[PDB]
């Protein structure tokens, strides 16, 4: 994926929405596109950057599809986990996300504790970045910290999974 | 319902305003739209979040149309009360709304005080909700507070009804 | 009148600039059409428009000086508080340029203060806006006040 | 030229990228683009503001083009060196840049440390500027400062280059 990443970024949002749906609806091309970005040096950082510089609803739609297909949230995170720098960009974007996009990613993680448990597990799997996701959550707008605290308090083990160390 | 709402979001804002004006000017389509959202899982919250992520002027014009047609502002917020978590979603948007949109929304509410009281009445009906709004009042830039002060000093009873 | 202001907003930005450019170039269009508004929503729509549209509309007032007076003439007639508030809520680049245009055209700067000095307004209102600012903007504002040593004394007065 | 600069801004964002991609390759147009801006009084400040208000990808891709062609990253900065304030406008933009664009600019400097030192040598040349960039970096978002420190662990040399 040397090029296309910019071309696909400048594809119309309705085509980006449709492309991401077909990519998620069938694991075909899903594995290819993320493997091409995985094998290419740093191209996984660009995709996340492109994905997280895209229109906000394109990012929300991808998160909703990853929840609807939990197996692909595994494969999407499995590629992000191995390649270097891809885990840091995902975290960096979390703070730089629009708070409505933040609350939707936090709402989907709470409703999917298995994906939430997968999300935190991969954070421990990546060298470091434990402090990063910590500081990103601590250094955030207060109502997000309030809302996240209330959602985690509904399931204390999910709260205990946030407490960690 | 995803096709109904998500396409409505991605459609051009001027076409959305055309639909919003058609939905408002016809009160029964307004009733139908929000009654259709109640049975569907979180369709109100989805439609709200879509409305919250839309263009600011569309949100503003939607607020104006609800002011010019008062009964629908009642229906919109009474449907919000019926839908669990909708008022929580609305107050969260007000905190995350662009400060200019917050001022226009506040000015329209103070100008039509019955809509301002009806705004609070449904917030208290929900499990919690009202407590969130009081914390949202704290976290805002000063020009919101100062411009709130100019209007609310001319009618301190509204500022009184806020603390009540 | 609502459609005119909303249609002018939702038009493509390049056409909005071309709409304002000839409207400002022809003095009758800037003088009479703005008088039809007299017969806040336009300011908000302008200040919710694309930054380039806001930048060029402010620059067009510099390119044609007499119409910047008229622009502030009608606003001062009835609205001033809305213009002062929109300044604080303006995008930082839009704000810097507006203050930079006043220093580039000092007669518009004095005219900006003069219309604000009408009634005991902006004596404290425009005072707060300067103090409630991020530091890096103030540095550029202060360094630009050095060019034109004359303007330094007028701001303190 | 003011029509030409505004035509470049309001050109479609994909068009702006294709124009900048070609302009970098051939120096003849590249030198013409900044020579015609420098012969005008203060037009370099205008084009910068235009570039600094363009789409984030347009701003990012222009920096990447200068990174892919390191000699022209010196030239584009050499042309800004001629007039004062354009450096300050470049620094003012860096603070006012979207946080992902500030990271992208710093990340390109980390991936090409020689261009980092190239850009940093220019800052000490302008009056202040090095003092202003000192203020900018210490007044950024915390995670932007945090991730910068992690980039200092990847390149501790840059810490010594900063001390100068």
Numbering used by the authors:
A (entry chain D): 2 to 166
B (entry chain A), D (entry chain C): 2 to 165
C (entry chain B): 2 to 40, 46 to 84, 87 to 165
The authors write:
We determined the high-resolution structures of five designs from C2 to C6 symmetry by X-ray crystallography, cryogenic electron microscopy (cryoEM) or both. C4HR1_4r was solved at 3.3 Å by X-ray crystallography and ~3.7 Å by cryoEM; the two experimental structures are very close to the design model and to each other (r.m.s.d. values of 1.46 Å and 1.38 Å, respectively) with triangular-shaped repeat monomers with inner cavities lined by phenylalanines.
